[PDB]
Amino acid sequence: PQITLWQRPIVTIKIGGQLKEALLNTGADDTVLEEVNLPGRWKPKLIGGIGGFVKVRQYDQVPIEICGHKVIGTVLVGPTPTNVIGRNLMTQIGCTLNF
Amino acid sequence: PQITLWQRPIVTIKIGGQLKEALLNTGADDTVLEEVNLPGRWKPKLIGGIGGFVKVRQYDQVPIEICGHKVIGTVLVGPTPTNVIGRNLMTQIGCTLNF
Numbered sequence: 001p002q003i004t005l006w007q008r009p010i011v012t013i014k015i016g017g018q019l020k021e022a023l024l025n026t027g028a029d030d031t032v033l034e035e036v037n038l039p040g041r042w043k044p045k046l047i048g049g050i051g052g053f054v055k056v057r058q059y060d061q062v063p064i065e066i067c068g069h070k071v072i073g074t075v076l077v078g079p080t081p082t083n084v085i086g087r088n089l090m091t092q093i094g095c096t097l098n099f
Numbered sequence: 100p101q102i103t104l105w106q107r108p109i110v111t112i113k114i115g116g117q118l119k120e121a122l123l124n125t126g127a128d129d130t131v132l133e134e135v136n137l138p139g140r141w142k143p144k145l146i147g148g149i150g151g152f153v154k155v156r157q158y159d160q161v162p163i164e165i166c167g168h169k170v171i172g173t174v175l176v177g178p179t180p181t182n183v184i185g186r187n188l189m190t191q192i193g194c195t196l197n198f
């Protein structure tokens with residue numbers, strides 16, 4: 001699709017057997033989601049850093065559907081003020097900025 | 100242009116007689132820049148919110164050139180870890196997300 005930016009670009013995703021809402025965020029390197037239970041192995045990752053770091057669980061090669069595009073990528077699971085799709089998954093869906 | 104998202108979408112802007120670099124950030128409602136001196140009237144604005152608010156100066160109807168597109172919009176001037184072009188100016192340049 002083509003998404004204009006008059007409102008926040010919130011989209012529906014399908015992950016770990018759930019439908020969630022998340023923000024398409026070109027300002028974020030990584031994808032961070034809260035309250036999803038993902039199977040298999042993970043390793044801890046420190047993110048943020050200003051004022052301290054936040055520890056999250058890094059899951060690799062996660063299948064995720066974003067607007068009906070089935071892709072694979074890293075998902076960080078942990079506390080976040082809002083669910084964020086970052087550049088790592090936007091590249092996978094072939095999402096670009098255009099003007 | 101078409102900007103892919105494998106790297107951070109940093110672009111050159113012209114503002115307040117200066118060339119600056121800023122991040123095209125679809126996760127940000129507003130545009131926040133530091134170390135720019137803008138003429139005329141402003142009013143304080145509280146932004147952020149998590150852990151406290153940050154006070155910045157809100158300038159309206161500022162002429163700004165973003166990748167050669169001359170546009171007009173609100174610029175918040177104040178401390179920011181990185182210069183951010185938010186949705187308010189992306190709409191002005193006609194910037195969309197596409198996949």
Ligand SMILES: CC(C)c1nc(CN(C)C(=O)N[C@H](C(=O)N[C@@H](Cc2ccccc2)C[C@H](O)[C@H](Cc2ccccc2)NC(=O)OCc2cncs2)C(C)C)cs1
Nearest residue numbers: 027028029030081082126127128129131147180181183185
């Ligand atoms: C909480 C939720 C309901 C939201 N609040 C908002 C309102 N706010 C505050 C903003 O629009 N904020 C803007 C902003 O930066 N956007 C933030 C929104 C936000 C708000 C509150 C708490 C946490 C994040 C989200 C932005 O993408 C920020 C801005 C930024 C980017 C790079 C470097 C420095 C700074 N950046 C990031 O999210 O980077 C985090 C990364 C994660 N993985 C790699 S980088 C301002 C700078 C203009 C939007 S969505």
